[PDB]
mmCIF file of C-alpha atoms in Angstrom:
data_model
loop_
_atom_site.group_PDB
_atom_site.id
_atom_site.type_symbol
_atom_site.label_atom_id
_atom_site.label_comp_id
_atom_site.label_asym_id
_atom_site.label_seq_id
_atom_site.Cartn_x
_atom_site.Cartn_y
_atom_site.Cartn_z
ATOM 1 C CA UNK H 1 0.845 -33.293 9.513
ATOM 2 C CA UNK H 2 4.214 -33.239 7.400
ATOM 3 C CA UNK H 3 7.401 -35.128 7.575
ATOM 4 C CA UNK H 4 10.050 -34.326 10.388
ATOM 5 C CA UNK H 5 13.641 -35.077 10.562
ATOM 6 C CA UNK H 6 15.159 -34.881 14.405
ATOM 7 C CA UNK H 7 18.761 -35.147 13.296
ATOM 8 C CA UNK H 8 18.483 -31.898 10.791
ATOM 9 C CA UNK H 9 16.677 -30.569 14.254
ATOM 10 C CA UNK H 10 18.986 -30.993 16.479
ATOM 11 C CA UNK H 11 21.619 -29.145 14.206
ATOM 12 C CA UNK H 12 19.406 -26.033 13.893
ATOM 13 C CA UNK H 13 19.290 -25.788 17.693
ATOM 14 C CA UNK H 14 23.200 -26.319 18.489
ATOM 15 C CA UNK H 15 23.505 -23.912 15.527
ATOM 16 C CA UNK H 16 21.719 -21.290 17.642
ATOM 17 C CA UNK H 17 23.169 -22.717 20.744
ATOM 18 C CA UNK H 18 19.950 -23.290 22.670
ATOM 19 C CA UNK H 19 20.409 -25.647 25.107
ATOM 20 C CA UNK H 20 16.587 -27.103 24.706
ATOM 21 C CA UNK H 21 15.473 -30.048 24.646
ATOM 22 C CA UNK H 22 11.956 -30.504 22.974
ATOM 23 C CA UNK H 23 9.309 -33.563 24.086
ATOM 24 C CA UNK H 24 6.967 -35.330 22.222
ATOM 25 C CA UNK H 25 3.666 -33.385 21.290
ATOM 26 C CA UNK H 26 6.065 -30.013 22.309
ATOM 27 C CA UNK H 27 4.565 -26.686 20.988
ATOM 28 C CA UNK H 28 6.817 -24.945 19.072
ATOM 29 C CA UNK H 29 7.135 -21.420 17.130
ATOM 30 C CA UNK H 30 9.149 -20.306 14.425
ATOM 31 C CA UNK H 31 10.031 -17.010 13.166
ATOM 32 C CA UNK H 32 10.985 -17.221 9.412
ATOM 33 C CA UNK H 33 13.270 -14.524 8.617
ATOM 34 C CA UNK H 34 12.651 -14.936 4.739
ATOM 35 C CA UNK H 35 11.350 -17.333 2.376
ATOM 36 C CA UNK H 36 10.034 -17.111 -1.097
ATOM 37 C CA UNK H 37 7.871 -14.037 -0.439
ATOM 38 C CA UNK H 38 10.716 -12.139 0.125
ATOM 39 C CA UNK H 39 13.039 -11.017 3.011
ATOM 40 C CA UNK H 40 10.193 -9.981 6.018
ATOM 41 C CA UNK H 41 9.682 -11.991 8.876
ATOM 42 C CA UNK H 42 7.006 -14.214 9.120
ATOM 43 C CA UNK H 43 5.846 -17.084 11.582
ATOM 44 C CA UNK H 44 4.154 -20.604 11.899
ATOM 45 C CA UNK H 45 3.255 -22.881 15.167
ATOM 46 C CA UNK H 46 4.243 -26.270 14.824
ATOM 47 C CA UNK H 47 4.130 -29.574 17.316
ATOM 48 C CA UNK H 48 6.452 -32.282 17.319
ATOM 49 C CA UNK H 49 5.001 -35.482 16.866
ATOM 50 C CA UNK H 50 8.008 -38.368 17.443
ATOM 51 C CA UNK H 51 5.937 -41.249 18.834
ATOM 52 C CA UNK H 52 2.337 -42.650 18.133
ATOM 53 C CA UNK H 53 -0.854 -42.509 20.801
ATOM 54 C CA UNK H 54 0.717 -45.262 22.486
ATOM 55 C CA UNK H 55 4.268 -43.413 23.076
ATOM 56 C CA UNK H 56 6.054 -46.222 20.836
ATOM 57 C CA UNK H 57 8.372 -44.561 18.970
ATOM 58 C CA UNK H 58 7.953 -44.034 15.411
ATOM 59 C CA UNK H 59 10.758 -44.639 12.706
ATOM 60 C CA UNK H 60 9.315 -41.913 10.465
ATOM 61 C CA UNK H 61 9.042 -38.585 12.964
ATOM 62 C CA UNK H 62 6.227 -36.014 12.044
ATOM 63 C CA UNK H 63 5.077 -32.367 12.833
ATOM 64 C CA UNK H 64 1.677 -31.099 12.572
ATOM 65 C CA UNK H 65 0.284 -27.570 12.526
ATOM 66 C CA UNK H 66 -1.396 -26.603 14.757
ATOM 67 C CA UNK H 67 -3.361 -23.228 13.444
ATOM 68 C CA UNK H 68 -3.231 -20.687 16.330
ATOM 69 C CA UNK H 69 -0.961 -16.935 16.832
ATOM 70 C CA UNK H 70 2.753 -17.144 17.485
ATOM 71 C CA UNK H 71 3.362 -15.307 20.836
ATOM 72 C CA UNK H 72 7.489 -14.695 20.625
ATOM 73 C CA UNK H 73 6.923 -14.203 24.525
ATOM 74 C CA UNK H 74 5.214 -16.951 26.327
ATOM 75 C CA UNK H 75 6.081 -19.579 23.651
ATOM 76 C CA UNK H 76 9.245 -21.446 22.494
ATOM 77 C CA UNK H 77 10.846 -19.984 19.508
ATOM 78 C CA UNK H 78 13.427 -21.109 16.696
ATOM 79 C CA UNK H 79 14.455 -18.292 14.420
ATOM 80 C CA UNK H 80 15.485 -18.292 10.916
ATOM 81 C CA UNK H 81 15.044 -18.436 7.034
ATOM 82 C CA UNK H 82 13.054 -21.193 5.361
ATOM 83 C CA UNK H 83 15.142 -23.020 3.525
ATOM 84 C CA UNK H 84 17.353 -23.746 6.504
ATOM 85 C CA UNK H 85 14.268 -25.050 8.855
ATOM 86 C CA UNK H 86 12.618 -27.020 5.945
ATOM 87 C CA UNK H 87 15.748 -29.356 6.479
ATOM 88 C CA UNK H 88 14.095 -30.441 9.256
ATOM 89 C CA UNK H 89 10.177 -29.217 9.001
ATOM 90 C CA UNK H 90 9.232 -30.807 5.416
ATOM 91 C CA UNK H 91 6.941 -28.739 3.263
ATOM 92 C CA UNK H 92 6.990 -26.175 5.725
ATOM 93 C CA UNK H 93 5.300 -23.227 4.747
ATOM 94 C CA UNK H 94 2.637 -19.930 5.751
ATOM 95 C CA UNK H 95 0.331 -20.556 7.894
ATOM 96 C CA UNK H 96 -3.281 -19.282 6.868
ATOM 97 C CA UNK H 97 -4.364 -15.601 7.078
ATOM 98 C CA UNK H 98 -3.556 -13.171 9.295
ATOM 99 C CA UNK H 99 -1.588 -16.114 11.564
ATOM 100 C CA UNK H 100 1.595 -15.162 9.593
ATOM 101 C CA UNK H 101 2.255 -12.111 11.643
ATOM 102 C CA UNK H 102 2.606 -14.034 14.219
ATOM 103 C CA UNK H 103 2.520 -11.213 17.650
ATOM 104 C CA UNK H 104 0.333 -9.308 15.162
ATOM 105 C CA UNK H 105 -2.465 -11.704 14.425
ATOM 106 C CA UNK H 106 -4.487 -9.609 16.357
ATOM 107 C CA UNK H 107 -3.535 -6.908 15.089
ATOM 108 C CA UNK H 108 -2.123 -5.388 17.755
ATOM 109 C CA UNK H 109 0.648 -2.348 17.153
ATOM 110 C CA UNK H 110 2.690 -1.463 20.305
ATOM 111 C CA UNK H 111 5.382 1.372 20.316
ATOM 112 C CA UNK H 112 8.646 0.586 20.934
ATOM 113 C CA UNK H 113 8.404 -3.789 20.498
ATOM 114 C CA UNK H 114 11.008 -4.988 18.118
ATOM 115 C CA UNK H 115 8.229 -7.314 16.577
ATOM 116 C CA UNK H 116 5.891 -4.489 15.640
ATOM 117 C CA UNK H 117 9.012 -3.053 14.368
ATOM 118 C CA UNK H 118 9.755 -6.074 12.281
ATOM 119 C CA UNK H 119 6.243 -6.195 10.923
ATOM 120 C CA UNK H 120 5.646 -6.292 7.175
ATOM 121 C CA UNK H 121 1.951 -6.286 5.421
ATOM 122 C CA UNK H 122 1.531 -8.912 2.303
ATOM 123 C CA UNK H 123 3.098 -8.777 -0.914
ATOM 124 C CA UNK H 124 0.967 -9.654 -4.269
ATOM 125 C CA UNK H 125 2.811 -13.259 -3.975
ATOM 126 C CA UNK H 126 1.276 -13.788 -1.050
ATOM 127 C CA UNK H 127 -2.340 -13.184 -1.623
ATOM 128 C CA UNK H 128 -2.169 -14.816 -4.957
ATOM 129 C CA UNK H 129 -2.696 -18.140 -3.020
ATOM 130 C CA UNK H 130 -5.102 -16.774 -0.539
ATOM 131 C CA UNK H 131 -8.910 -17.415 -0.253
ATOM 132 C CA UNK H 132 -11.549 -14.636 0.504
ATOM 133 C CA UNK H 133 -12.296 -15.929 3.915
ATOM 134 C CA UNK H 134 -8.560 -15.616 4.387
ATOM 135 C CA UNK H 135 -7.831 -12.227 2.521
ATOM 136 C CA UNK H 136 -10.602 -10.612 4.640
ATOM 137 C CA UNK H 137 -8.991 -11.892 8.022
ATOM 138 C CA UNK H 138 -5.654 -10.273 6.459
ATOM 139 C CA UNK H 139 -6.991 -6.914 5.489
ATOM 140 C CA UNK H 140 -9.082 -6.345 8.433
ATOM 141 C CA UNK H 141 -5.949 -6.862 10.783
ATOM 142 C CA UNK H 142 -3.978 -4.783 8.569
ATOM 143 C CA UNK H 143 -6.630 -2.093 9.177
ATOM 144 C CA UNK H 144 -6.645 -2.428 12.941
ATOM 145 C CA UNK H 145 -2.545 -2.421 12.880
ATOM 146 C CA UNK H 146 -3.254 0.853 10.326
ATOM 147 C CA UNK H 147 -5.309 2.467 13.116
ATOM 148 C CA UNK H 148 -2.814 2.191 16.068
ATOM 149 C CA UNK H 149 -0.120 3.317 13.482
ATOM 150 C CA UNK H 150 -2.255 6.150 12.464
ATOM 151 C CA UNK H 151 -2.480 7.257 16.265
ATOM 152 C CA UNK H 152 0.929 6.742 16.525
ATOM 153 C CA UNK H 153 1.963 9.378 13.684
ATOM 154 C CA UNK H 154 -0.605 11.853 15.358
ATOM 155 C CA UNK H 155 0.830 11.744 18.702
ATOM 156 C CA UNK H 156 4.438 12.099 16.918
ATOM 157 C CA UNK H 157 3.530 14.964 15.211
ATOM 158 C CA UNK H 158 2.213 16.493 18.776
ATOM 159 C CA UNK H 159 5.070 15.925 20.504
ATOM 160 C CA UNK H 160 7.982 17.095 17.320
ATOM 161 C CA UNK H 161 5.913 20.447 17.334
ATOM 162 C CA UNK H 162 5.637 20.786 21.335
ATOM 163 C CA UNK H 163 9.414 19.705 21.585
ATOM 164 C CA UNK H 164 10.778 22.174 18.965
ATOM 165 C CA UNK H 165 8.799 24.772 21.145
ATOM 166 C CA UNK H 166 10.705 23.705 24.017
ATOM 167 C CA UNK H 167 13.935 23.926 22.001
ATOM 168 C CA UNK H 168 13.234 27.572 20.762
ATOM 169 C CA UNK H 169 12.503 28.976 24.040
ATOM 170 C CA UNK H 170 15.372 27.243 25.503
ATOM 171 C CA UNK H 171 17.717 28.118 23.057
ATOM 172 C CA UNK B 1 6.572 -41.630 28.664
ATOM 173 C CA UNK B 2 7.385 -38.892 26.793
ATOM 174 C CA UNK B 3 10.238 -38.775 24.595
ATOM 175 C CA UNK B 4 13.396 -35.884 23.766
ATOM 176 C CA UNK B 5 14.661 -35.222 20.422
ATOM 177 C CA UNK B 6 18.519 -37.077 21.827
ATOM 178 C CA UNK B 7 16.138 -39.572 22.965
ATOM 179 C CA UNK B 8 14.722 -40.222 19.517
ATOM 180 C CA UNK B 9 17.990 -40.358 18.635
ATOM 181 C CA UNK B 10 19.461 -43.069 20.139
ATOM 182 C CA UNK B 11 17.255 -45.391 19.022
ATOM 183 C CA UNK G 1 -23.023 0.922 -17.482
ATOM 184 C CA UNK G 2 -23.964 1.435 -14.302
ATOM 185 C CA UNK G 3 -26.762 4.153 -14.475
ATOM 186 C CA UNK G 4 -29.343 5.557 -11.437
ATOM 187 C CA UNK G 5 -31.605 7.793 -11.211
ATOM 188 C CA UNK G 6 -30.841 12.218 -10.167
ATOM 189 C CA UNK G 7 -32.851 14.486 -8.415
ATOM 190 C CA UNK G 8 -32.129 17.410 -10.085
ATOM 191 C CA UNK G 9 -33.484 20.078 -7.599
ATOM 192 C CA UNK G 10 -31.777 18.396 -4.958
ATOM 193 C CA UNK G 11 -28.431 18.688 -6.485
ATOM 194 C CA UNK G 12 -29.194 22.767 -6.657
ATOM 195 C CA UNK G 13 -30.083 22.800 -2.951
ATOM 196 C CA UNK G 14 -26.581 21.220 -2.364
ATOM 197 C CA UNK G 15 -24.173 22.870 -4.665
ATOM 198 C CA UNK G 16 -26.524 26.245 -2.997
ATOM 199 C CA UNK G 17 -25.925 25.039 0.877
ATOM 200 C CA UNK G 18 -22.151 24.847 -0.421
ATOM 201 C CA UNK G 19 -21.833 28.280 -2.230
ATOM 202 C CA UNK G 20 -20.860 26.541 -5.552
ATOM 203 C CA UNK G 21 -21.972 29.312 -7.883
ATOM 204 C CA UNK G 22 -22.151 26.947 -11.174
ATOM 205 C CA UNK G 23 -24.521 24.628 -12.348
ATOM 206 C CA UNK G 24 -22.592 21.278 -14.127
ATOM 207 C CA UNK G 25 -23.527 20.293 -17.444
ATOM 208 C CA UNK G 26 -24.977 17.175 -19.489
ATOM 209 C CA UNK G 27 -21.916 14.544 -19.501
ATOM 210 C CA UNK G 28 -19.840 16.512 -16.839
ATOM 211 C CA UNK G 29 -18.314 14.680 -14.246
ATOM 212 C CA UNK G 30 -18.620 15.078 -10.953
ATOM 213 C CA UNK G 31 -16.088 14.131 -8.194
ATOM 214 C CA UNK G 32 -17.732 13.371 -4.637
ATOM 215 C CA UNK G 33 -15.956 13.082 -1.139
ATOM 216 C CA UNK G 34 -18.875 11.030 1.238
ATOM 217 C CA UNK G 35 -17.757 12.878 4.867
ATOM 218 C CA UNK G 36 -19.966 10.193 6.190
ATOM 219 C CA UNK G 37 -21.336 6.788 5.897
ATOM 220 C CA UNK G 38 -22.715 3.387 6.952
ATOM 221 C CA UNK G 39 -19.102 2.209 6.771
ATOM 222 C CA UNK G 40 -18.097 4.671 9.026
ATOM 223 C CA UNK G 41 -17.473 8.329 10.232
ATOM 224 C CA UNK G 42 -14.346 8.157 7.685
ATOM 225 C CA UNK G 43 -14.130 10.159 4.437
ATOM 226 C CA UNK G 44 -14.786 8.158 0.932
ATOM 227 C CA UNK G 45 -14.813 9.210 -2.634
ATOM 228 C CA UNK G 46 -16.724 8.705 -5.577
ATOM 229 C CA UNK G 47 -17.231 9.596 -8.937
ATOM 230 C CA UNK G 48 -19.945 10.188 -11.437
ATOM 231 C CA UNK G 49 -21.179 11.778 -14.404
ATOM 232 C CA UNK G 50 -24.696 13.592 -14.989
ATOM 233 C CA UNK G 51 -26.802 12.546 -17.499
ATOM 234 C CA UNK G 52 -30.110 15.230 -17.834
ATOM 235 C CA UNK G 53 -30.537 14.530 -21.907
ATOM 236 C CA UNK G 54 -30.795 12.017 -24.088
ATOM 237 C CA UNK G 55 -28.913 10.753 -27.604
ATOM 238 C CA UNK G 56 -30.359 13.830 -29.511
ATOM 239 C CA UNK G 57 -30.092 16.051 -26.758
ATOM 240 C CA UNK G 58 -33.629 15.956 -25.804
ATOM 241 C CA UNK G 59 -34.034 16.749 -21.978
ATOM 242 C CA UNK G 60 -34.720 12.901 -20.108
ATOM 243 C CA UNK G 61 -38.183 13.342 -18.210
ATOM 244 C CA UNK G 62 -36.321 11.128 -15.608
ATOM 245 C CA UNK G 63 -32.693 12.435 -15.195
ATOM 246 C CA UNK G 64 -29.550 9.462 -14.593
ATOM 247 C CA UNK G 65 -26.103 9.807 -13.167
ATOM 248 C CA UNK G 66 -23.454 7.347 -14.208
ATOM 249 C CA UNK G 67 -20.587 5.624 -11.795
ATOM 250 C CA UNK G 68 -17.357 6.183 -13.251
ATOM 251 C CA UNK G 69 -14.453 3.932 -12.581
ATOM 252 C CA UNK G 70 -11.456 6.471 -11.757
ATOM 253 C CA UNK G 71 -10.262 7.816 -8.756
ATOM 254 C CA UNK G 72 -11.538 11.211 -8.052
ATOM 255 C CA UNK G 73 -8.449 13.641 -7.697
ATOM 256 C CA UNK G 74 -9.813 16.625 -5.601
ATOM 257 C CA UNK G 75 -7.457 19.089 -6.534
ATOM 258 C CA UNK G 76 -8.227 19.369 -10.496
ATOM 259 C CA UNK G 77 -12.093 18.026 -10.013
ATOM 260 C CA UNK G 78 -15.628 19.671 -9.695
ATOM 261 C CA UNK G 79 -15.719 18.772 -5.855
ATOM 262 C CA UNK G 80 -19.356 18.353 -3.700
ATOM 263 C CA UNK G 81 -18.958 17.101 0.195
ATOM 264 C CA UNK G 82 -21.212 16.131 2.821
ATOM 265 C CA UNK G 83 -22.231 13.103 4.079
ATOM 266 C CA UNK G 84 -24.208 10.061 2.239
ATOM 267 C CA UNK G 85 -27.264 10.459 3.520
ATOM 268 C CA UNK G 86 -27.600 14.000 2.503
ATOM 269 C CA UNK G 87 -26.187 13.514 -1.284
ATOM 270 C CA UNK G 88 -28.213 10.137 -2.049
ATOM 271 C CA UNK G 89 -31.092 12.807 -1.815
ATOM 272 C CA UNK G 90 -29.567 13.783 -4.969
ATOM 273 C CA UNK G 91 -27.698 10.778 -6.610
ATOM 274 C CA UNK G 92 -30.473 7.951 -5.673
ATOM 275 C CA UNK G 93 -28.967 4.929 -4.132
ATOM 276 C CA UNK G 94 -25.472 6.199 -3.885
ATOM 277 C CA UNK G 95 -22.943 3.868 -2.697
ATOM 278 C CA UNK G 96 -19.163 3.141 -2.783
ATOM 279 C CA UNK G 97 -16.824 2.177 -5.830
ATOM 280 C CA UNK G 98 -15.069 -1.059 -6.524
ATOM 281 C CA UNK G 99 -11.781 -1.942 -4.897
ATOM 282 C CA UNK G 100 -9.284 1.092 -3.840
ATOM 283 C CA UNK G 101 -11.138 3.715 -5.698
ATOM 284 C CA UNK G 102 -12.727 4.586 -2.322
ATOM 285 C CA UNK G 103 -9.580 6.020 -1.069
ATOM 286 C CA UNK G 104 -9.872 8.554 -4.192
ATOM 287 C CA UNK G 105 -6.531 10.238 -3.863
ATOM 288 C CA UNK G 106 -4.984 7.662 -1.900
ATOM 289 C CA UNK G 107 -6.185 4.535 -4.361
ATOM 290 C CA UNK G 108 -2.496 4.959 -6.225
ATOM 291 C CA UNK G 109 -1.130 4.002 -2.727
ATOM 292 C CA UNK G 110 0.617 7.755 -2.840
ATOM 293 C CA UNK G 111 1.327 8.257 1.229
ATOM 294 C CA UNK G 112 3.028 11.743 1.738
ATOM 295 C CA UNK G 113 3.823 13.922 4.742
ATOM 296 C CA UNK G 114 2.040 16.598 5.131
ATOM 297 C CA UNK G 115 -0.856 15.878 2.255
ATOM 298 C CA UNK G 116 -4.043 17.061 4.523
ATOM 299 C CA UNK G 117 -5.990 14.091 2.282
ATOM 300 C CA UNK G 118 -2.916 11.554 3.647
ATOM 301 C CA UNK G 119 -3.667 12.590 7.403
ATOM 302 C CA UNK G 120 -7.468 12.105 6.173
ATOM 303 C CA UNK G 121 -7.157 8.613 5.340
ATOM 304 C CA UNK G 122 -8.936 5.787 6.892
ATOM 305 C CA UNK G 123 -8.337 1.974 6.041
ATOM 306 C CA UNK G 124 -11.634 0.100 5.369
ATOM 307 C CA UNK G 125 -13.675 -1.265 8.241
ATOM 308 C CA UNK G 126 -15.264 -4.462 8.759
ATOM 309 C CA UNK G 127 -18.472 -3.142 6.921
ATOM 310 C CA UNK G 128 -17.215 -2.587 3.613
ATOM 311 C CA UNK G 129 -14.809 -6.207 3.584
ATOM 312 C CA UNK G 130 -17.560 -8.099 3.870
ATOM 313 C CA UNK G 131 -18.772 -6.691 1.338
ATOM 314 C CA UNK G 132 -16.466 -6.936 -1.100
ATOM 315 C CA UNK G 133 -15.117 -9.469 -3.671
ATOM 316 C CA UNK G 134 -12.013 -11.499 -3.898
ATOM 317 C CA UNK G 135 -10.259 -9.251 -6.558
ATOM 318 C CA UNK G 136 -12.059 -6.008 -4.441
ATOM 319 C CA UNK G 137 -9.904 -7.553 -0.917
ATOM 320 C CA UNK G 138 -7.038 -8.337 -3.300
ATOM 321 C CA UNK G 139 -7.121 -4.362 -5.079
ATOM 322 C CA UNK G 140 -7.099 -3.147 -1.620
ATOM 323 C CA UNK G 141 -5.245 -4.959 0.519
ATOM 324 C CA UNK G 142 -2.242 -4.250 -2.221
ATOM 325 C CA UNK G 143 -2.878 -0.533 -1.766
ATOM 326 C CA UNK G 144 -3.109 -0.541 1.830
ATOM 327 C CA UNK G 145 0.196 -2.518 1.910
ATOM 328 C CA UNK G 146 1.612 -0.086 -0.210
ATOM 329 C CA UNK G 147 0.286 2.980 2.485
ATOM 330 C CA UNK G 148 1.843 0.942 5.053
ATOM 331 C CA UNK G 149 5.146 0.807 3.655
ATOM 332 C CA UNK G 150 5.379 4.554 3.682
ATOM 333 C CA UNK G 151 3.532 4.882 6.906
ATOM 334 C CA UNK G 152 6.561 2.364 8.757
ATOM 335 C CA UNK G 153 9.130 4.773 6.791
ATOM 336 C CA UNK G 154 7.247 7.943 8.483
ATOM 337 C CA UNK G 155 7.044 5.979 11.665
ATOM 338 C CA UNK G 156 11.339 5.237 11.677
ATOM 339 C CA UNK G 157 11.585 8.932 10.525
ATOM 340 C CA UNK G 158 9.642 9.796 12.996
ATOM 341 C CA UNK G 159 11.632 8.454 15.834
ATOM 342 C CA UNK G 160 14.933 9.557 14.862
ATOM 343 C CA UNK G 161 13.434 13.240 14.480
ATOM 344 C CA UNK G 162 12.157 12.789 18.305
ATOM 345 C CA UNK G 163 15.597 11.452 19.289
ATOM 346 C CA UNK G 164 17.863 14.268 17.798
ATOM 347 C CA UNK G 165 15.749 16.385 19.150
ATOM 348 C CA UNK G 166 15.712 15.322 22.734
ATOM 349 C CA UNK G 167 19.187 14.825 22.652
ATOM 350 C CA UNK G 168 19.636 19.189 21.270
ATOM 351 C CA UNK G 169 17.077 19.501 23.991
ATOM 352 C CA UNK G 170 19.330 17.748 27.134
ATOM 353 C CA UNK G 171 22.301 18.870 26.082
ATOM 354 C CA UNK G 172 20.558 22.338 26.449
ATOM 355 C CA UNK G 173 18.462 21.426 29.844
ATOM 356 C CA UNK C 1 -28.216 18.823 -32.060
ATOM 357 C CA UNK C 2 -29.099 20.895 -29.169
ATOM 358 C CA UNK C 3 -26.253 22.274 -26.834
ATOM 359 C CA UNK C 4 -25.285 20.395 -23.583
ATOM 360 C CA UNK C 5 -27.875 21.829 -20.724
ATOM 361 C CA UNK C 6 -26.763 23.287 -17.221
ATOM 362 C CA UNK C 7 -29.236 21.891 -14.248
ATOM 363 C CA UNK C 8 -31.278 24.868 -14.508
ATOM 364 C CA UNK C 9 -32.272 24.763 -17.875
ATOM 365 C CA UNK C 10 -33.102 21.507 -17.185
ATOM 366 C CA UNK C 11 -35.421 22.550 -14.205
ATOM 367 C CA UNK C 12 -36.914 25.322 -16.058
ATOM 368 C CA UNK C 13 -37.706 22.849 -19.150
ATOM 369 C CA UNK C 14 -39.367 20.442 -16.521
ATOM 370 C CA UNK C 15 -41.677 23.988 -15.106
ATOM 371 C CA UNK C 16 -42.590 23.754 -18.926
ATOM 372 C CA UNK C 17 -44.839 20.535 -18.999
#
């Protein structure tokens, strides 16, 4: 659980014009567009905490991570780079292991979505402040997204050589 | 009850 | 060092099965593709260098091989494939290098079109990362990264080839 | 110092003793 700050909040949504108005204990995702591991899109889930267990309002907001996949689709999303979102998420940074590709956690490659498009593996910054637990997570999802991109250059290769047959005959 | 982020706010 | 021991008469039966005329010398080394494995049904390399004699060039009564640290490169090497179980009949307790030296031609990270040992490549499976150590998942996951680079640039390359081409193709019927 | 040995020689050596 980390610091939050609802006015530098509410900015970053008029600022994207979203018209949302997040609760208390509201599950929220965020695709950072770049941070200090470079320029490649990562995500984190956070939750909005702005009252206690009692709902009385606290003076000092707070977000807490909560350590599960980012799914762009079925979730609530706020997009952009770090710096500008840790004026309102404090301390904000990766989440652990393979979470940080968000849509790709699960290492799960799809032709033609934007996301998988998007997708970037680690740099050496990165795993310089991983554990082996969490490296392992990383590199066997990376394998997994390897295989369906593997599949993917076979089955482009199949169809440039069956569609420059097509051409030839029908040219 | 359940508060907003304008309802935080204006407080 | 890492030293084990060599079956000698297996290695002939091998290089034999293969139609490798020549017999390797004391100190030569010896690059190995492993077709096969408990990690999987995906090619693996390895390198080593036979040891029959000893210090004064005395013949050992109990032959060694030697693991060296260097990615095998296939196209300058002394090459023997086939899969584990048939060459650790020969190199006792034969088993895979540290880190990215698996990949053998592919442990630089070098992705190209085309290279038949590029459309060979495998990423490691569960098997071998749990395995390995810290700096080993470190090693590899920065080569793999590095394969994946050039396989997204392939990929977008890819596309644009299929697109033009359609598009020559329609215009065409 | 003897010269290096193929595998043969080596396998013919070890038919010696």
């Amino acid at each position: 659980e980390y610091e939050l700050d609802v006015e530098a909040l509410v900015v970053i949504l008029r600022d994207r014009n979203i018209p949302r108005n997040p609760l208390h204990g509201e599950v929220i995702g965020l695709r950072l567009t770049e941070g200090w591991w470079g320029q490649i899109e990562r995500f984190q889930m956070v939750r909005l905490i702005l009252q206690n267990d009692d709902n009385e309002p606290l003076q000092r907001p707070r977000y807490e991570v909560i350590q599960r996949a980012v799914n762009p689709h079925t979730m609530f999303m706020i997009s952009g780079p770090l710096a500008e979102l840790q004026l309102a998420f404090q301390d904000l940074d990766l989440p652990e292991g393979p979470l940080r590709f968000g849509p790709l956690a699960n290492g799960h490659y799809v032709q033609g979505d934007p996301y998988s498009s998007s997708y970037r593996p680690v740099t050496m910054a990165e795993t310089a402040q991983m554990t082996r637990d969490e490296l392992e997570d990383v590199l066997n999802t990376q394998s997994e997204i390897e295989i369906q991109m593997i599949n993917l250059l076979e089955l482009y290769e199949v169809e440039t050589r069956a569609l420059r047959r097509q051409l030839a005959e029908r040219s | 009850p359940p508060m907003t982020l304008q309802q935080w706010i204006i407080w």
